[PDB]
Write a structure and sequence with these properties.
Four copies of one chain form a homotetramer.
Chain A: H1 4-14, E1 16-20, E2 24-27, E3 33-39, E4 49-54, E5 57-62, E6 73-76, E7 86-87, E8 92-97, E9 104-110
InterPro entries (chain C): FIP_sf, Fungal_ImmunoLectin_sf, Immunomodulatory_FIP-Fve_fun
Protein name (chain C): Immunomodulatory protein Ling Zhi-8
GO biological process, one term (chain C): regulation of immune system process
């Protein structure tokens, strides 16, 4: 199906845009835990937050780590999971949360 | 800003479509309480669920009532609010939840 | 691909919407000719125009006919093809034209077989 | 008015994307003529074409110039306008044309 109309709506309204939500999953100690997730280049037109779902459990929406100098942004699952990383046998879903209307969009999923 | 390209992407992909999410807020007793919300004609291509947020407090997701033969669908806030209606002095935000990815989209908002 | 986000953007911005662009191809005399196209329920948020392309040849834009009381709108190819229908052996493409920015979107195609 | 749903649809389906359609208009000689337009980083998933409209006159579609090694792509108005630049007192509209369906999307406008 041809969705180029949607892409050129974004081109027309933003003109110059670069993003990279390729998930970079950071492991903890021991290595079987997933401690965090980094996106190399997030969108910055709003102060987006992130919601984390662990094995079907909503861990909530927390304060974002500041966007780093390279444009990356990191989500630290220890802030969502009571100070512990997430066992890599569990599904992890990460949603961006629009601060203006509260919408949320799946941007990463860990599932071994 | 001109979004006709998005509108006609939906036309080209769907061809014939009718929906009606005009919020019909159902009042309780006393009349100052809002007990529910009915949409006259919801989308039916998935088994959508609804999340309710009351004055910024996330009430979560519940099972949906069936789409009615006239196309309407009811969201009963008593199912979300521990058996109680919501005072109309509080903000009510209702999100449709996509079951394929868990995304949520604001479709109705009460705010005095 | 899951494009429900695009649909609910339209839901959120329009709230109540009904359209039907199922093509209804009207034939002339001889019945071999395609003389017009009717859409049962067009969008009406702007005074859209239509461009017609006849077997790859652009026939340009013309003023649109009024949207009818039942919601339908007719595109009359005699207006685009100097008073004659289009032989049904030719492909026909019909684009809606946004009057604000001049964008064009394919909304109907006639092609035999 | 909030279109983040559309933006994150593109994020979710494309994951990593960079484009730049900031118009770099090239003037001719004399300087009052607009001879061309360059986009620094175009989309490349289709062999897109360009339509040019000058002062309400549709000049049609032409062969696209190749996307260069740096990602940029140029629209030469002399190819559309019979060997002449466009006087800068006229409106210019440039549309990207989807080769799959012939749709056209405005990407640059002079006045």
């Amino acid at each position: 199906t041809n969705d180029s109309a949607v892409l050129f709506y974004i081109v027309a309204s933003q003109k110059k845009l670069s993003f990279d939500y390729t998930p970079n999953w950071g492991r903890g100690s021991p290595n079987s835990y997933i401690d965090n997730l980094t996106f190399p280049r997030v969108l910055t037109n709003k102060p987006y937050k992130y919601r984390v779902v662990k094995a079907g459990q909503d861990l909530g929406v927390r304060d974002s780590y500041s966007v780093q100098s390279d444009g990356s942004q990191k989500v630290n699952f220890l802030e969502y999971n009571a100070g512990r990383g997430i066992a890599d046998t569990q599904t992890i879903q990460v949603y961006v949360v629009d601060p203006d209307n509260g919408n949320q969009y799946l941007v990463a999923q860990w599932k071994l």
